[PDB]
Amino acid sequence: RKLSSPRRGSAGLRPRKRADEILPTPKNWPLVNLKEPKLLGFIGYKAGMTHVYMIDDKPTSPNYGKEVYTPVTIVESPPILGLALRAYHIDSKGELSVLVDYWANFEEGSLKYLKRKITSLKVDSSKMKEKLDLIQKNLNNITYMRLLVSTQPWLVPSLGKKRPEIVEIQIGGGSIQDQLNYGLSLLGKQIPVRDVFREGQLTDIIGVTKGKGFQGVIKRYSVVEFPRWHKHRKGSRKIGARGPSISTPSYVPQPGQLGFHRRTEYNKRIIKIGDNVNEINPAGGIVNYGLVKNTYLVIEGSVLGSRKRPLFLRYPIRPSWSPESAPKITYVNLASQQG
Amino acid sequence: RQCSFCGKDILPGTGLMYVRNDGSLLWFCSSKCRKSMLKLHRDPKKLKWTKSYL
Amino acid sequence: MNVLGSRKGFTPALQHNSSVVVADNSGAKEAVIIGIYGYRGVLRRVPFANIADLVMVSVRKGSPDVRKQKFKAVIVRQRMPFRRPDGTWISFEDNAVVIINPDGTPKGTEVRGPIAREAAERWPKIASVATMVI
RNA sequence: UUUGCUACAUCGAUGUCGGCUCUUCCCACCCUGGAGGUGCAGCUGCCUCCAAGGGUAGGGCUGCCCGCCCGUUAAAGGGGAGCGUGAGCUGGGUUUAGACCGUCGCGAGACAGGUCGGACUCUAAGGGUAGGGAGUGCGGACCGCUUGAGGGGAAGGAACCCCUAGUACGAGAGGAACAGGGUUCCGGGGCCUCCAGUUUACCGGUUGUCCGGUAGGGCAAUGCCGGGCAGCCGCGCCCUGAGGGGUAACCGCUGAAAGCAUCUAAGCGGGAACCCCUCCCCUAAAAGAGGCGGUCAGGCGCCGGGGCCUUCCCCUAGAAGAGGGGGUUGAUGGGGUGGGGAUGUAAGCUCCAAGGUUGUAAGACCGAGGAGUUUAGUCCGCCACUCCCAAUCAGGCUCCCCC
RNA sequence: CAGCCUGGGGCCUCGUGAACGCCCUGAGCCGGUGCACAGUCCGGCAUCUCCCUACACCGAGAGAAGACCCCGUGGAGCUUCA
RNA sequence: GCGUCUGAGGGGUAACCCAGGCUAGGGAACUCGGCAAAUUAGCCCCGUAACUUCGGGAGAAGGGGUGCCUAUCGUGGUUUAA
RNA sequence: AUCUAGUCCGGGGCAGGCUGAAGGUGGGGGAAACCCCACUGGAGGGCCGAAUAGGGGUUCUGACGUGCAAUUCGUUCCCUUG
């Protein structure tokens, strides 16, 4: 008689549809957090996963000052390319539309890799001179400054592609005028990961999870399979009833697409930023990926997505604590991942 | 530390320690070595993928 | 009692109606788990237990004065492998318990065989009579 | 939400008990949150008011429902949806035909008494739901980046432990709370470094038989047995703040009606797991159908041209579509060579072999098997380098706006 | 407390080629009205068109002049103290 | 003698269904009910309880052995054959 | 009365194994009656057992249920000298 059991799955994630882009952008950004002009995110590629041995940093942890074993994910992060500067304002209708974009590639930054995504500006249409004075004229009613950046996949051979991905990253820091000066110095340059993050920080990861195709209800929602005889008896991998009513027969479990969803993670700590790839590459290569040869991040725990997945790394928006530098690492598993 | 069947080195964070009712300990680098003592009872002196062959 | 404040939770090794050996000289030899102290669960799931857990047992084999009686016991050994925080996997040869008095002291005066450290840290009175601790 | 009363609807049929599976709601509150009273010292109790955001589990007995009982738990609340749900299952109960017993009947036979056996049909026009593709509109053809009206969420809930503190309180016995930490369990979302499962790729052993023997193979639903990479998976691992505003029950301030008093009437201040924002997921088919950067060469309708798609080589993706890449200005797939792996040390040849057949003897001949050559041979749905081979040929659609 | 693997279907394509539902095509849903549970009526809130797969909750879904129950100065077989 | 129990092709082979293989720790906690599935299994030697209508129970229950190679021994058949 | 029920007349069948009744013979005992053992013998509405040798039709309340079929197919089973 009608015992209690919680519903299967979350009602807040519907629809479970396919993500419409492989690199999503955050909708919301962390507050200023009392800093000086800097970017609030970076872009990386998921490579593989291993495990290290570190000495615990958390002063409240039960294992404080002791050598504990932790899994880690490896994220390859070459420099990105700063493309344009974007200003937002509250327009008529009182919205958050875009004021203008100020592009700068002609002085230095003549790239045809960039034309694999956008058949970008001709020499005839380099009239960006009057886009900049519009920003300075309409200063004092600009609310946000954002920088368009581009990935450089051609620097990652294991990632067999050359056309880039284009996203926009927000600047948080001093005044608006101060942020405009900082955004003009990055324009057309190459932004290393160390200009944004530092070892020991927390981050938020946004990306697309591994796809799995059309699936049933026992994998999509973890419903209970019919017990005994029914394991033998007319079909077991299904739900019994599909609602009571003709009320638009409701939101009950149904089969359909599983995986390849846009999701978000919280409070993923960065343990190391390295350049010497001989300290991270295992014997025989990372299985099904290749070899690391750029700057890489060591992120403890797991990360959504498959190998070679573009990931957006963001400042923590509900941080759990505030770490300091140096989670000392004593061992890194460089053994082969086959066998 | 070293495997109890094949004699090779066990990297940290991998393997298995097996405790017997008399208190003795056995270390295993993989399931292939764990099965070869506890299940199959094969002897290591006849296999030359083992350090005990010679 | 004393080490639960760490990550006291392992592989779910034992259940209701699971059989164990009694690793002490109290008089019992075999038992069956009747209840798991502290567990609270979900629909259709059988309550579970691992090393250093308090359980209620019913003695199925032993001396006439303890046979078919209900006691309190703690799990000291388990067959199913479990991982220590320093990343090592441990495994024992059988599932065993030791029978304790209501206040926590062991009923027997001697413990047979090895004991996991998590059981010795959480239950100091058992560690006082255990000879070998693994 | 029971059981009756009535006989309005259905008798050319609305499948009639219980259980399982899955969804949602009510509040008359069992626990979790707030406030008060007490014959409230503390701990524990009892009672009243607000509040439905979250939870309410495992078993023995009976076809059950109810109920009794076992070990726990923060608590193991009570109801509705055609007593929710048989084009979802089941078939223990019940209401056919067969049969036994007791009572009743002259009998044929009856019971509302017990017992044994007894069938569960259907390929989804329509709606709904879960997902995936095209078209028209906004708005002449395209490439790229965005906002955040609106919509959904439980995305988290709870308990135990540390210190506070053997402190307050109390004769003693006993024995707290706020602030601040940790973990575990239930729910949600993900992942494959470790461990575990699988692994009809692969490697080996071996039984019976067939291919003349050895070697190599066919068959015995991989013939069976052992091991097993990648991948997928859980029994493994990671993440899963709080704050602002508005209030509920109520608690207070100033203050009269009504010289006083008074939290309320005017006028103010506080105050909850509640509601709204912050956070996470879908969002320009939002009709007020948004914003921003760039391309549509040139010459005199024609020449010429830009873009997109199929074809071609593929995988991150994939029921078909779609998605994500490469296309000689190239490492996209294969070959070659190295690396890293799985089995377990190939065939042939040399030596030994319990014995036997010979040979005057010397010697040579058979022999399950052992050792050497030999971390061998076979294999790799992983990685690196290298243009050796192939990404060629061909077809279709749509545009040249502004100036 | 489910996971992985295999044979035959399902899925995509070529050939052959039916049946049941059918006043109508006009069927989104919530509260009502009414022989007392409406696709069509009233009041609202919604709703751009087409196609593919999957699910069977609703259409008091399809299939059979209800076997239960009562009636008819309808039967048939059995019984006996009619 | 047949590939005529007379339709085929494609597919990194989706969900799901009909048949099958394997699963760590636990071992009936499932369910009306151990249903279904698993366990055991041939032959030789030893050994075998209560009960009993003295015939049975009885293959009760339970324990040990089994391949390959190299040689032998014993018993018997048959051949004009003590 | 080509199905089916019973009967009468004339025909055709049941692979392969096991147990071992009465009877018979020879040892060993006791005076005796008679007892024990070994072998031989081959009884019985005895036992195990061939998808498709023949016969049946219990389970899964398995598949099918606009069928291969107006009663079939698969698994698990029952009988087989009367």
Q: Is A234 exposed, middle or buried (0-12, 13-18, 19+ CB in 10 A)?
A: exposed
Give the whole-angstrom CA distance, residue A281 versus residue A334.
6
Across all strands, nucleotide nearest C19 (CA–C1'): F26
Q: Which helix (H) or strand (E) element contains residue A4?
A: none
Residue B46 is classified by DSSP as G
Q: How far apart are the first and last CA of chain A?
A: 51
Question: How close, in Å, is residue C99 to chain A by CA atoms?
Answer: 30
- Distance (Å) from CA A2 to C1' D250? 37
Buried/exposed A210-229: b ≥16 CB within 10 Å, e otherwise: eeeeeeebbebbebeebeee
Q: Does A53 contact B13 at a Cβ distance shorter than 8 Å?
A: yes
Q: Which amino acid is at A258?
A: L
> Chain D: nucleotides under 7 Å from a protein CB?
18-24, 54-59, 65-66, 70-76, 79-82, 84-85, 88-91, 127-133, 143-148, 152-155, 160-162, 181-197, 226-233, 235-241, 278-284, 288, 290-296, 307, 316-319, 323-327, 331-333, 339-345, 371, 375, 382-385
Q: Pick C44's closest partner by Cβ from A51, A69, A224.
A: A224
Q: Does C87 contact A224 at a Cβ distance shorter than 8 Å?
A: no
Residue with tokens 């002009």: A37
Give the whole-angstrom CA distance, residue A34 versus residue A227.
58
Q: Which chains touch B (3 or more CB pairs under 8 A)?
A: A, C
Cα dihedral A305→A306→A307→A313 (10° resolution): 0
Q: Does A69 contact C87 at a Cβ distance shorter than 8 Å?
A: yes
Give chain C positions within 8 Å (CB) of B38.
none
Helix-then-strand count for chain A, H and E:
4, 16
Chain mean position to CA A65 = 31
For residue A133, CA distances in Å to A129, A142, A186, C55 come to 7, 13, 18, 77
Check CB contact of A335 with chain C, cutoff 8 Å: no
Question: How close, in Å, is residue A71 to chain B by CA atoms?
Answer: 10
Give the whole-angstrom CA distance, residue A148 versus residue A81.
8
* Token output for C115: 């004991």
Give the whole-angstrom CA distance, residue A177 versus residue A188.
20
